[PDB]
């Protein structure tokens, strides 16, 4: 039984890592450990560690210290802001501007705000979408495949297995023109700089395309050359 | 951490002061000194009507020569500095828009505007922003909101917000970013940021000349240039010289510590040297920071200084170096000016270095109601213009607005109250005073309707006037006393107690000095003002006499070019089904290579209850699902944003694509097989007919394709309406995917139609109907069935297209996965049913041909087949055409060995099927198994009376056959066949059976009766007890089925509840139901079959 225990995990984790990385915000993540204000009414400059991660629904600004405990405080933040078709960034932002976040948390939300000079809001918000619909027809996809995993013929199967991962690159290939402008757009933070790249979330659901579409390739040979 | 030892400013003025935040911000609301004075109330503002026509109140007042001289001698450097810091504090004139007009209706024979006498010609304008949360009640009436920080610290120099100083800064050193010459900024970040309009006087405009500022306007003259100039050089030069003596200092705190010198020295020259020159009376002093006084920009300001500068802005302005030489006529003209891209004479530093010192030795013209023609006649227009009136668009913002009127907002600012016109101005009316009474003929002599602008142009003699001079005052005084960043504020920690003693002595001579590079004796100790000693007198009063002229008006004209393209964009969208025809001609051509009319209602009225029903719902829901997006769109106008632009060319496309939506998705539950085998054996038959799925599906397709053809010629008008919209109206319409900037020149047709992923997809989606509907029809499956069969199965990529068509934020979300869900699921399950089982290939033994259209067709059974008396079939012949498959009724016993089928001919796959046969029985098929219940229900009963009729006497031979057998063979009693008929036209083979099933029956088990039902338009078509036509023992009666009293006289001849199993048409099945119940109050299921 241990060739169907195999057959079955892979599929698992085909659907699985669809549906992770759907809703998983590491598709594009910077990272640096910059000085950087604090807040107003305050000269005090704090060392903080300050990075983002979009995940085509929104953004995810973490500015915490490199100690805990900076002045008489604690400096822990984790900030969403969403621009999905549901939501609204600018209202999120006008928002979170009175609440007083600290000062590079709303300087990198504001980049994103609709109607502003480096334009990253109406390139991702439409990625977001089309990356995250040609991810559930993916989905779609890989359940019809593994119904045509059982007395119906097999080729009609590993067709679809095919087009999981066929859908999966097209996904993949959507967010790939999200870096001409996020690159020229500065994120000039104190005395560092902000690069975003490709994260985890981009690697692996390329993985997992090109294992699809050699298993569909697979079993095409097969059933096309020895039906065993 | 770093040597930047206090408060960095922020630069959208947020948090500038602790207790209330919004203060002074990028988008706060301007408060009002008087309450609005709106016409209802609200949001509505005075018109012509009520208040006089702007273009006739800009004629006779404000009009006269342009070559009066100031009277303080005010040079005209101050004049154009006024204007770069009132872009520091103030900006209404961004149009905001749910789109909303109020245009200048220009009178008959203006001899600018309308020189044709051409009746009447319109002149646009457009609203301002408006903040959302007001303008709902009287009790907060609409209140415009300021795009610029309302406080006076540099926000024209750095831009207003953080996003806006990072693309106009190069992070080397702290310099502002230059370009190509190192005295002029980027043109090249000029394009996202800045605000581009066509140069009027050429028609240029394009992003190759635009600098890079942080007003977003600070173009709109050569002469807000070289100011932007001159304040972007001495950042530069200051920051640089603090990189010459701090040399380990980052390229951030060298930005930050000129930031601040420079802002520092902006503040005390436009509060200490410019404003007690504009208004003639020093500011009192400065006290303490005060946290309470209220620094929020008002309307009444805006009237008072920004509309009010224009009174002594000259026609043409000088030029001069440093040792008076007035060449480099030689003075450029203001009319030609505007937003001009790259300037013959100030193409170097050395020419705005001229021109600098050209502005600050012209004595700027006279303050009077008197304004010069290249802003009264000569104004870029905003819009469908060239020119435009500016004094008449200024009267009509302050009617937007809701600026009080001059009386009201006098009295109400603690001036004392004038009586009548002759006492405004109590000098004017010394000498020349027609004025006056020219500007009360225009009011019907009611002095208290006169607006705030003309009222303050009339009575400021010299000087501002005693009205504007009082608002512009305090407001600058509550500009610095709740200003937090005040560089002489003593508690941020800004400046030293020495350092603020060395920019309260820094003029606007010590600047341009330093930046020009210049000796300190070719300007003046005081820039703003000339007083007769001073170094180059200026050489005589620039009239318009002598320059050249200001280029002339035209209309901007959209859709100019392309309208020849539009019309054969349009004419090939037409001819879609043209081409389909002509390929399919082709390819079939190719292919052959190798008072009795009621009653007739009444017939037609019992035979389709149920084909009416079905109709009536589908096109009840159809219609409703229309009327609700129609009632939607026609009385909600949600933000009244599209509803005012296209009227019909939404509704009539925001209805049938919700029909369509609906149609093209529930159309699949009809070609769902193994569900409607299931459901037309259920007692569901009865209501809904199961065996006109397909006429149904032709009857819904062909619905679809006008409404689709509606939906199509809707946007075709709205993509042409949106192609003659300006940009300020597409940018309302469709956010986000269009941005206002002055371009004003929207996109055209095609980038609408191929450009666009709904009109791709849309134009693909027309292309791929078009074919499919022309290769599906009855002409082109007859002649071919895989013409059908290839192109038939582009609704896949149809269903790929329609869900890519909606996923796009237009005009709704997309809806028509909501509509998809379910029926794709339902339909792939019984496609998947389908695909499971197994699809036998049998050969037919002997096909003989019968008379009449039946086609006997006999071939062997397969071991692994078993079915019971009444179960159809599905064959496929593949000798001629697809695989196309086709439901047929078995007509042999069980028990035989080999099945058959009596075929009759009923279109184009059976004749052809009758063709491939003829004269014999070679080719095969491809048997699918039965396909019923095949209901034995008759075995239970003592008596059976089947009573099939019409067409549905088809499956009754294999029924008696059966019967007959078990009968004979096995050892229920005296079972009827009653079978009614019409012609017994193709149902003559029956005629054979039922006598071989007489002959085999010898315990007479089985008793038969014929009625044929038929008045005189017969044919006739007609011994040993029998007759010698047929040679059957069974009397074929000519009338019509007595069903009752056979019933009523049934239960004598013997004493026994029996089966009435009856098949056949409705009007037929449910009269021997009446039938049946007329005697059930007595000694009969009457179980209907459907087989
Ligand atoms: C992307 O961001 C979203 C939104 O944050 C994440 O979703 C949230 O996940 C958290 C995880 O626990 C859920 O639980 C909440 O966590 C809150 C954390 O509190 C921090 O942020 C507060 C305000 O944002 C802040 O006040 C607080 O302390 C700070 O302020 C104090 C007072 O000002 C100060 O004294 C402190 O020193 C400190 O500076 C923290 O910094 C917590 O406050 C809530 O009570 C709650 O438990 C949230 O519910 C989630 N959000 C929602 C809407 O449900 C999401 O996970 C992020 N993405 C990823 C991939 O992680
Ligand atoms: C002896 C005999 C027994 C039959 N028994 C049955 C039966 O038990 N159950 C049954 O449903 N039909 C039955 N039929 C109908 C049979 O499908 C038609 O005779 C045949 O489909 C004609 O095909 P055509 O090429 O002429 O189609 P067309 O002339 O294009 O079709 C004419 C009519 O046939 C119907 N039709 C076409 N294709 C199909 C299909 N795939 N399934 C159902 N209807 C279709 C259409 O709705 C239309 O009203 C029987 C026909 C014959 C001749
Ligand atoms: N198979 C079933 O057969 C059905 C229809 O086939 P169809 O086209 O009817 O074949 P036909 O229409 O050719 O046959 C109609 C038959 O029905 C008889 N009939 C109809 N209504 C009545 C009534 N109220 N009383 C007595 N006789 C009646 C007709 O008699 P007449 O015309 O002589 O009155 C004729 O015998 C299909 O819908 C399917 O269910
Ligand atoms: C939407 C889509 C669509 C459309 C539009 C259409 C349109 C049409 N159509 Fe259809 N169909 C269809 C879809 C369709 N369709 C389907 C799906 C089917 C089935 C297929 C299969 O089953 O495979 C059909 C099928 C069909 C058929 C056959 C069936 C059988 O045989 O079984 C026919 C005849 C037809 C016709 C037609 C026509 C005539 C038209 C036009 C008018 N179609
Ligand atoms: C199929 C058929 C069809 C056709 C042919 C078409 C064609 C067309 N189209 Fe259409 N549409 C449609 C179907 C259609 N369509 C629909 C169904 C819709 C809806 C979608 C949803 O609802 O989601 C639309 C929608 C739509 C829209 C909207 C979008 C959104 O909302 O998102 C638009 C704009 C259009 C356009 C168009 C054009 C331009 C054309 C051409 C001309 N469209
Ligand atoms: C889920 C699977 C569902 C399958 C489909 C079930 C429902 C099918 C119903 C449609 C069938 C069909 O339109 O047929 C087309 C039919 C032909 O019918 P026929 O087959 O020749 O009749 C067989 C006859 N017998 C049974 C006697 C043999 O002409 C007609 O209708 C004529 C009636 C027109 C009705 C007009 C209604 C007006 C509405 C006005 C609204 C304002
Ligand atoms: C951040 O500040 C700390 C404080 O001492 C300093 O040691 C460190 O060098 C600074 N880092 C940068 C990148 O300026
Ligand atoms: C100023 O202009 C005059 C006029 O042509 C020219 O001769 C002179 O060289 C210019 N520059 C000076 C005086 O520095
Ligand atoms: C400081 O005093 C006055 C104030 O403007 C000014 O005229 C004078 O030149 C200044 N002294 C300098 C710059 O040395
Ligand atoms: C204004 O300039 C002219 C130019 O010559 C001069 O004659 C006049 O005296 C100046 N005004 C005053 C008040 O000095
Ligand atoms: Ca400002």
Redesign the pocket.
Known sequence: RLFWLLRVVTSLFIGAVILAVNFSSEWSVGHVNANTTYKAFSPKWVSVDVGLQIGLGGVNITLTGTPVQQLNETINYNEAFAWRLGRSYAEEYAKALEKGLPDPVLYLAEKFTPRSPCGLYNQYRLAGHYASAMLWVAFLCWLLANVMLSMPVLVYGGHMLLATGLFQLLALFFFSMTTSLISPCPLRLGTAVLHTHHGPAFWITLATGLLCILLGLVMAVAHRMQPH | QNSISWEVQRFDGWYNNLMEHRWGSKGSRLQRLVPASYADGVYQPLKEPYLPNPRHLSNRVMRGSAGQPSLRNRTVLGVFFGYHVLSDLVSVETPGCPAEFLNIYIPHGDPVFDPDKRGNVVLPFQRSRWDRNTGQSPSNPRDQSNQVTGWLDGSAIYGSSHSWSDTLRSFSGGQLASGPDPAFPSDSQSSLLMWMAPDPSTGQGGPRGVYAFGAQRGNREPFLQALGLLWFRYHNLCARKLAQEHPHWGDEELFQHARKRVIATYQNIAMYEWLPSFLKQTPPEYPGYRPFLDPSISPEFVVASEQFLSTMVPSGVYMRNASCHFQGSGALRVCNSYWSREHPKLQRAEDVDALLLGMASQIAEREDHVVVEDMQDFWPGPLKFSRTDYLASCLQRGRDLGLPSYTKAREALGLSPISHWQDINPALSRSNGTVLEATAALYNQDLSRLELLPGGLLESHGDPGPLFSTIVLDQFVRLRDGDRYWFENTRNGLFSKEEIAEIRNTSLRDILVAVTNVDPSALQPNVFFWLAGDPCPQPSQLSAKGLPACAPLFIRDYFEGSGFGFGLTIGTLCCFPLVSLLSAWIVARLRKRNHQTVQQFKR?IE??R???????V???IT?ALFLERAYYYAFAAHHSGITDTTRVGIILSRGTAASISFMFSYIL??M?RN??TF?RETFLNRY??????V???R?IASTAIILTVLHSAGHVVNVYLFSISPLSVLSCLFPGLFHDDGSEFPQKYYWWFFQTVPGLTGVLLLLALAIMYVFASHHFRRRSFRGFWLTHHLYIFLYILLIIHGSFALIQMPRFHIFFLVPAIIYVGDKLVSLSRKKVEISVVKAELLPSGVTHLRFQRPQGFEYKSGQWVRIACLALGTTEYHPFTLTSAPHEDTLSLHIRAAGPWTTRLREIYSPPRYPKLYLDGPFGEGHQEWHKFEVSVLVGG??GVTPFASILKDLVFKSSVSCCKKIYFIWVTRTQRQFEWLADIIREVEENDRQDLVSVHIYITQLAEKFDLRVLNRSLFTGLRSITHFGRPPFEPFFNSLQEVHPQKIGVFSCG???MTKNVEKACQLINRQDFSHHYENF
């Open positions: 037609f035979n389709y149920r084909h009416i029903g079905c109709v009536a589908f096109y009840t219609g539950l009809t769902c569900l409607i459901l809904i007919p199961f065996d006109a799925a006429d149904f599906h009857l019409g067409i048409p409705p009007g």
